[PDB]
């Protein structure tokens, strides 16, 4: 029927506390890591390197990279990033896990901050892959190894083969990893809520995940702007039943949502403790 009593953060929180809401899926994008100093390269002034390119997405297009990996690589030296430490949103997703609410987190992001926030591979679908690993492109390497190669401004080449080595990312025009489809196809039969945070839903098939959700399943967007509207979402029409849109920074929305669940305090302590810990290892 209509599981939200109110199309609001207040309504969602209230729903999250009911016994009906057990399995939560988070769909997240570049918008949940920018406060961690990771610039959303899809919604860029950010590029400014020639390296003459027909358009930014070209450097991430797989054909182009294989012939001209340089634009991609000069970038990735430009965003270090100095050191990685995850956001309130990230740590929100951790509390979900800890509280037995996190069915799965599907990320478009390649920073691996979900992991550093305490989320284990079981909990996680790295839809577009990781930097952690890298392979010889020749279908016949660790972070540094590679990290060093990137900061030396020389392109990654295979020890054995001398062919290009790319990080284990899904480039555009590459197929997404298996796990993604097997996971989507049963997660989305079980899901009670959808948190969509920090994403514009301009990448496929990732963004088509919001339409796998059951008709009854409410969906909350925490994004700077509205997105995925039409199966598509419906926040404002008179027909609207299941969808809620909170506009602002991700970190702010997660603190708000957390306040209504009575977790703000725990979350803030958690971010603090974990960031202090990270510094220690320096």
């Amino acid at each position: 029927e209509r599981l939200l009593d109110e199309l609001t953060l207040e309504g969602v929180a209230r729903y999250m506390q009911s016994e009906r809401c057990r399995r939560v899926i988070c769909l997240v994008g570049a918008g949940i890591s920018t406060s961690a100093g990771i610039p959303d390269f899809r919604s860029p002034y950010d590029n400014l390197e020639k390296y003459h390119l027909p358009y930014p997405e070209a450097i991430f297009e797989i054909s182009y990279f294989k012939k001209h990996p340089e634009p991609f690589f000069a970038l990735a030296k430009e965003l270090y990033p100095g050191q990685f430490k995850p956001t309130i949103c990230h740590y929100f997703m951790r509390l979900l896990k800890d509280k037995g609410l996190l069915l799965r987190c599907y990320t478009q992001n390649i920073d691996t901050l979900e992991r550093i926030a305490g989320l284990e591979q079981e909990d996680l679908v790295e839809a577009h892959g990781t930097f952690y690993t890298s392979h010889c492109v020749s279908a016949s390497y660790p972070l540094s190894w590679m990290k060093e190669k990137i900061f030396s401004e020389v392109t990654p080449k295979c020890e054995d083969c001398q062919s290009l080595v790319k990080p284990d990312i899904v480039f555009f025009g590459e197929s997404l990893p298996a796990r993604f489809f097997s996971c989507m196809q049963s997660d989305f039969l079980k899901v009670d809520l959808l948190l969509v945070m920090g994403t514009s839903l301009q990448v496929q098939p990732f963004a088509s995940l919001i339409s796998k959700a059951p008709l009854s399943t409410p969906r909350l967007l925490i994004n700077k702007e509205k997105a995925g509207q039409s199966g598509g979402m419906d926040f404002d029409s008179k027909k609207a039943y299941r969808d809620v849109a909170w506009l602002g920074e991700c970190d702010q929305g997660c603190l708000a949502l957390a306040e209504l669940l009575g977790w703000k305090k725990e979350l803030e302590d958690l971010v603090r403790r974990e960031h202090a810990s990270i510094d220690a290892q320096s």
Partner: peptide, 8 residues
């Protein structure tokens, strides 16, 4: 095309 990353 199939099911692999593709922008807008």
């Amino acid at each position: 095309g199939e099911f692999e990353k593709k922008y807008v």
